[PDB]
Subunit: 223 residues, 3 copies
Amino acid sequence: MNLRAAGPGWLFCPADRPERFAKAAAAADVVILDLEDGVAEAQKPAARNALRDTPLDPERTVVRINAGGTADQARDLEALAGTAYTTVMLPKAESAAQVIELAPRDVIALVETARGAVCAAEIAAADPTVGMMWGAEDLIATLGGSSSRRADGAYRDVARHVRSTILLAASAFGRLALDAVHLDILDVEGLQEEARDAAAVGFDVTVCIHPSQIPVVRKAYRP
Amino acid sequence: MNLRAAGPGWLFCPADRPERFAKAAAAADVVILDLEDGVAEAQKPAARNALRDTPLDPERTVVRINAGGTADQARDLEALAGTAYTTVMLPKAESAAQVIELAPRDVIALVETARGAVCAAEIAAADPTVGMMWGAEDLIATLGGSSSRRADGAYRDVARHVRSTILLAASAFGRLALDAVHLDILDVEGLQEEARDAAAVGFDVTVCIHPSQIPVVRKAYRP
Amino acid sequence: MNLRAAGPGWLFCPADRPERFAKAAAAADVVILDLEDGVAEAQKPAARNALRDTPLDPERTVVRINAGGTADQARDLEALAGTAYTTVMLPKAESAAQVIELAPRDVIALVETARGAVCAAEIAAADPTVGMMWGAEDLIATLGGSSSRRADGAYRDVARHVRSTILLAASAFGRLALDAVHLDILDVEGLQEEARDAAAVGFDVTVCIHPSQIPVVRKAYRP
Ligand SMILES: O=C([O-])CC(=O)C(=O)O
Ligand SMILES: O=C([O-])CC(=O)C(=O)O
Ligand SMILES: O=C([O-])CC(=O)C(=O)O
Ligand SMILES: [Mg+2]
Ligand SMILES: [Mg+2]
Ligand SMILES: [Mg+2]
């Protein structure tokens, strides 16, 4: 695997919508096929079938599976066996052990809980790890909070603290660093500012949830 | 103990002023009877006697004892034996061991030194721990600094870093998270902003030093 | 050694320019003779000779050597043997072991990489350590970034996170804390603000790269 060779534009795409796969792969540098919150709890088995019969370039495609310890992740690995994918994205990554149990595939840990932020280095250190990502939304939620950004749009302090935390963790161990998804899709000004900053700080990628986000991300990382 | 069931409004009240106990308990969700810097070094033995003959609901009352390794903390535990209190707040909490030696009572660790911030997770992990709190004032002081806030009123960076640090530590281990006391009592605008933010970020409590602070705190955590 | 007794004004001075040594020592509280990036890769052997025949007060002088594991650091220690200097500054300090191998001399660790920030406490804990310093420029560079400050001049978040990280690390272990060099020499307003803040937060020193920077630093730490 050499996802570092790919551009900075990564895009999420629900695994239950195989019709969009082709467009997504063509629009992004890397496509993250989602089996998690991007697919209804009743559409998962469908998304798993589509993940099989509708193949995508394993060179530029990662599969986001479900959280460690769940039944859905178990079903995800079973469905992943019938594909040529080697890299998985683990949500709510909270320990090296959750990463290790995914060996021998490559794992991008998505830190989005307090325990994960606290064990960020341990997670980035694990052998299977090839990338570190963070998410503000589940972070604030699992914290018992209700807002990741303040009035002025800027992320709250805890989220900023974590962003810097996973950047250092990922870097300290030669892992790829992925910046958080800009949830307000129509807010391209905001995305541009975060992406520019992410480029300037060392992040290698900024994940997008909408194809319209890719060109702004690719431009912010231009130079 | 179930202090989580109590409201977000916690209030400090010097143990040498038993006359105010009743008013305090009635005004706050939880009352922190203080045996530390809230009582003159010569009024401590008095505060200890008042802690005995003037009982308060052990369900909504915690006792802040003195720092680990001191003679005063020793005298505090002895005086605490003659009461129905189970939860203590430990100032200058700098290690799991300082928490552990307070077993079998429940402990809320108050991180307010560099060593404590550095060992925040170790402290939150300890078995006796049921809550994590932070304080900017002793933090800057023990750091050799002289100001916790900058011109614009906002906390300096080191303090903000620590605030986020104890929030993640406390949360990662299912502990209660208490935000720092707003020292400028008449500045309700400032308190409102910090409390709102604390509510939004996951803090479960914002400690107050004055009864007039409680209603603003309770409102900020409204929704 | 008692560098804490010295003023807050520390100044870098290339070891290949022995003519300036005298002026530098007279202008600063402590002089950091540089054998690293402050001297051309071809002028190093010259700087090493000048470090020998042109002595400076070992009480107020530290020598910045080259990174652990390099040939240049090896040549630096050999040249350092013929001098009365006891304290060295280690760039790209990334572990306790890199510090330990410099025993028995005193070491000021300069954290300026992700691994170093991640192991900040381990480094500050090492026996040889007497000081902790940080640098934004190599930090962003080694991170794969390209800018340590944002449009408004303020340091980017990752750099601010690290600054606070080495302050707590150094303090938690009774080490001296040195704030980052203000690269824009003619920007005295900016330096004044950072130095004032550093004074207020607990930093004991603010390193300068130009003699004109010392008086502003000394004034910011006045009170
Ligand atoms: O589902 C999404 O689109 C994004 C998501 O879960 C996350 O960032 O954690
Ligand atoms: O004494 C007080 O009122 C508050 C205090 O010590 C602290 O926050 O650490
Ligand atoms: O060379 C200089 O002048 C400053 C430097 O390397 C650093 O701060 O790391
Ligand atoms: Mg998520
Ligand atoms: Mg205190
Ligand atoms: Mg450098």
